[PDB]
From a paper:
The highly conserved eukaryotic multifunctional polymerase-associated factor 1 ([name]) complex (Paf1C) was originally identified in budding yeast over 2 decades ago1, and robust data suggested that it plays a vital role in transcriptional elongation and chromatin modifications. In this study, we determine the atomic structures of both the human [name]/[name] and yeast [name]/[name] heterodimers, both with a resolution of ~2.53 Å. Our analysis revealed that both the hook-shaped (hookfold) [name](57–116) and [name](34–103) occupied the concave channel and convex surface of the right-handed superhelix-folded [name](1–249) and [name](1–313), respectively, with very similar conformations, although the sequence identity was low between human [name] and yeast [name] or [name] and [name]. Our results clearly reveal that the heterodimer of [name]/[name] or [name]/[name] is the core component and is important for human PAF1C or yeast Paf1C assembly, yeast viability, and Paf1C-mediated histone modifications.
Next, we used the same approach by creating a single polypeptide through fusing [name](1–313) to the N-terminus of [name](34–103) with a TEV-cleavable segment. The crystal structure of [name](1–313)–[name](34–103) was determined at a resolution of 2.53 Å with one molecule in the asymmetric unit. Superimposition of the structures of the yeast [name](1–313)–[name](34–103) and human [name](1–249)–[name](57–116) heterodimers resulted in a root-mean-square deviation of 2.63 Å for 198 equivalent Cα atoms, indicating that human [name]/[name] and yeast [name]/[name] subcomplexes share similar heterodimer structures. Similar to human [name]/[name] subcomplex interactions, the [name](1–313)/[name](34–103) interface could be divided into three regions. In detail, region I was also mainly maintained by hydrophobic interaction through four conserved hydrophobic amino acids in [name] and corresponding amino acids in [name], and by hydrogen bonds between D61/Q150 and K191, M64/K191, and D67/N104. Substitution of these four amino acids in [name] with serines (L62S, M64S, V66S, and L68S, referred to 4S) led to the complete disruption of [name]/[name] subcomplex formation (lane 3 in Fig. 4h). In this region, [name] had a longer loop than other species (e.g., worm to human), including a shorter α-helix (αC') that bound the N-terminal tail of [name], which is different from human [name]/[name] complex. Notably, the [[name](N16Δ)] mutant did not form complex with [name] thoroughly, indicating that this longer N-terminal tail of [name] is essential to maintain the interaction between [name] and [name]. For region III, D95 was the core amino acid in the C-terminus αD' of [name], which bound with R221, R243, and Y10 of [name], mainly mediated by extensive hydrogen bonds. D95K mutation in [name] also abolished the interaction between [name] and [name] completely (lane 5 in Fig. 4h).
Author numbering: 10 to 264, 283 to 295, 299 to 308, 1041 to 1102
Write the structure that this text describes.
């Protein structure tokens, strides 16, 4: 398959001489990012290096450190050079805000921090795709689905208008499509949603988040529970760290029994599963409950995270948002292109 893996090391050009200090992004980052700040400031390092480093923290479980670094960068870079620092801070706070167990206030507190940085970013660079996507993602995360879909639809018209103005053909943007597919599913238009998720599978079969999660949720809401489960097992196969896939595969296959999956649910919901330990009125109760909690995550198991796109938040290169042009679409993926 195609590859969206981040460069795994960084060379910082030293200021006085012309040697380069190499950093292994996966083991060389210190617990206190101030150490690099010293280096980065001292050697007059370029801004994109601050970003690349902060993204390494975030993508290796260290978002607080990622945030601490770019917040320090804000004391170094001036005026318009601060825009892309604010964009990073927007997406870092959107990632925080997706925290699995935040109370509605902590969520909104993090989303406010994102919005504040977003305002500073758009003030300098309103047409940057990183800032436009964040505007839509903020509406989504706040549940304002109608405004999100309407803002999305204005944005793609704008970009289309812009391609006439530069004599270019438009290329579908995977995250605008992903946002549309998710908004459509919120509006219960599961058929239009499913088509977009399937479009995404052929454009970028290594897209994060996995559009197969959405493929399965569309099948499920369209009552083809057999294929929903196949989409989800394909997701969990290509990436066994996908917790959302895991919980969906087991909640789906779980339609004695209520022991076999509490033990499989401890490997990687477990509350209400234990509430359901409390004429088969009962079988419809466990059935309803499994359905309710398969639908409990308003994020649909597909968190939109710009930190999964090499070059995007650290170099203003949005190329990877358009995916790949040859589709070796594997046997177990091409199945998922089918109708219900
Ligand atoms: Ni914060
Ligand atoms: Ni905070
Ligand atoms: Ni046109």
């Amino acid at each position: 398959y195609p590859s969206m893996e981040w460069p795994t090391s960084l060379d910082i050009p030293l200021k006085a001489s012309e040697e380069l200090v190499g950093i292994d992004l996966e083991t060389d980052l210190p617990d206190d990012p101030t150490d690099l700040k010293t280096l980065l400031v001292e050697e007059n390092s370029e801004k994109e290096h601050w970003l690349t480093i902060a993204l390494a923290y975030c993508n290796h479980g260290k978002t607080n450190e990622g945030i601490k670094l770019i917040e320090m960068a804000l004391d170094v870079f001036q005026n318009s050079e601060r825009a892309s620092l604010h964009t990073f801070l927007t997406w870092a706070h959107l990632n925080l805000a997706k925290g699995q167990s935040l109370s509605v206030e902590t969520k909104e507190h993090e989303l406010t921090q994102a919005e504040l940085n977003l305002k500073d970013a758009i003030g300098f660079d309103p047409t940057w795709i990183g800032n436009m996507l964040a505007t839509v993602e903020l509406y989504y995360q706040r549940g304002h689905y109608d405004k999100a879909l309407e803002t999305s639809d204005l944005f793609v018209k704008s970009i289309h208008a812009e391609d006439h103005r530069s004599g270019r053909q438009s290329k579908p943007n995977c995250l605008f499509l992903l946002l549309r597919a998710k908004l459509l599913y919120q509006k219960k238009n599961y058929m239009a949603s499913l088509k977009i998720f399937q479009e995404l599978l052929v454009i970028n079969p290594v897209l994060q988040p996995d559009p197969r999660i959405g493929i399965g949720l569309c099948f499920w809401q369209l009552k083809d529970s057999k294929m929903a489960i196949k989409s989800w097992q394909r997701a969990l196969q290509l990436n066994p760290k996908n917790t959302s896939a895991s919980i969906l595969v087991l909640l789906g296959e779980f339609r004695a029994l209520s022991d076999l999956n509490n033990i499989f649910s401890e490997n990687q919901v477990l509350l209400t599963l234990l509430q359901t330990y409390y004429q088969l009125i009962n079988s419809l109760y466990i059935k309803t409950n499994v359905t309710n909690l398969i639908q409990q995550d308003e994020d649909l198991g597909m968190p939109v995270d710009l930190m999964k796109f090499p070059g995007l938040l650290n170099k203003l290169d949005s190329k990877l948002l358009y995916g790949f042009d040859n589709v070796k679409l594997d046997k177990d993926d091409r199945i998922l292109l089918r109708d219900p």
